[PDB]
Design a binder for this molecule. Structure first.
Ligand SMILES: O=C(O)CCCC[C@@H]1SC[C@@H]2NC(=O)N[C@@H]21
Ligand SMILES: O=C(O)CCCC[C@@H]1SC[C@@H]2NC(=O)N[C@@H]21
Ligand SMILES: O=C(O)CCCC[C@@H]1SC[C@@H]2NC(=O)N[C@@H]21
Ligand SMILES: O=C(O)CCCC[C@@H]1SC[C@@H]2NC(=O)N[C@@H]21
Lengths: 118, 117, 118, 118
């Protein structure tokens, strides 16, 4: 049920495909930040989830470079898929920008995105 | 200078190839936790980093499921590559385990790994 | 604006007094984890926020030790107060448990809590 | 012990006092960022740690307003005190800046500071 087009609360668009090999592949389009149009994404999910009610662990990465623009940053979303009526992906994320060593302390933003298909 | 074998301070070994597209492909062997043997990794990196002296931003993910076991969890490392004599990959990570939604508040461990050649 | 009772989506209850000086004092009661009854909180807030409509920065810490129970752990919430329609305090938090050195890699949980007056 | 003068890897000076009541009080002086001189800090720590070799959980907060300037931001450090050998304090921290609603996704930085007495 992961495979599909999802939207973040931010309004960003997350198009993903979950392979039977546990792969995640698609594109990301951010509603905010130093970004434009779509960015490639790759990640991994648990292809054989617990059957107890547990969500499905997954993660994916976006390097914020594409054909038009390079923010010299990468975001990784770590989280889980939750099934049901209104399936959601609840994540937390780390957005690291390349920095000088002096500035590494402020290299990384953290936050949380929730994704629905609506 | 990212492609090859990297070693975290925990003892873990990260084996990776960086493709010109911006792909990261490889395998991770954890020294800790619910883990055994090698695990597939996939991620992205900035193929065209800045020149002012900035590291190369990258991130990758491991779903802790392989031939030998399934821990029902995944880790994303987000951070940057810093070249030079003692190159490093300096990361922060998020490890999300699948939980009931009642337990989702404690789903996610945060930490940091420094990798070296 | 900050002084008073606030409620976590989780169910937890947070009572604070914001000192003119920038002090945060009060109690926290968790709806989850190794916790029982109320715990002391202390923290700091920006007592001179900007006037552009920007939220008010603040933070607080709870060590999960009280007269009843001790989890050997601590949580810090970092975030901002937003006033208006429905005032809110939006946060992210870090919960660190005491661990041996060999288990330090798994010492800390990360999440987010949004608080409201109702 | 936790009381004393601590130095982060960053060069920052952490001057803290751990009370009997489990309070953390003192001043923080960052070597980096939109800050100068000393800022009040306040926090909590576990006054009754385990005795299995487990570290000591604690955390504190700094609002980055003082008499010289106001960054409209606050950091919280969450971590644990590790005694014996080169005693040290290992933390992760969250730095939230007051922002509009639109800009809240980039309001929070995250990192890790290790403190030693050297
Ligand atoms: O500004 C950059 O460095 C690149 C744009 C990053 C946008 C971030 S990634 C986390 C969050 N979720 C989104 O959909 N957008 C923001
Ligand atoms: O326990 C699990 O759920 C799977 C193995 C977890 C290993 C973690 S990922 C973060 C940290 N860095 C490592 O090299 N290993 C641990
Ligand atoms: O289990 C412990 O060690 C104590 C944890 C207390 C509850 C946590 S703190 C972060 C989150 N927000 C809450 O209101 N409760 C949980
Ligand atoms: O820039 C600001 O908003 C205030 C300065 C913040 C300095 C940060 S707090 C985390 C890190 N550790 C330090 O000692 N300094 C930086």
């Amino acid at each position: 049920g992961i495979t599909g087009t999802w939207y973040a609360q931010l309004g960003s668009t997350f198009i993903v495909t979950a392979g039977a090999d546990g792969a995640l592949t698609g594109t990301y389009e951010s509603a905010v930040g130093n970004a434009e149009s779509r960015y490639v994404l790759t990640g991994r999910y648990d292809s054989a989830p617990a059957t107890d009610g547990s969500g499905t662990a997954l993660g994916w990465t976006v390097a914020w470079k594409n054909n038009y623009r390079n923010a010299h940053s990468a975001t990784t979303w770590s989280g889980q898929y939750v099934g049901g009526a209104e399936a959601r992906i609840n994540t937390q994320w780390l957005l690291t920008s390349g920095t000088t060593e002096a500035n590494a302390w402020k290299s990384t933003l953290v936050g949380h995105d929730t994704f629905t298909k609506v």
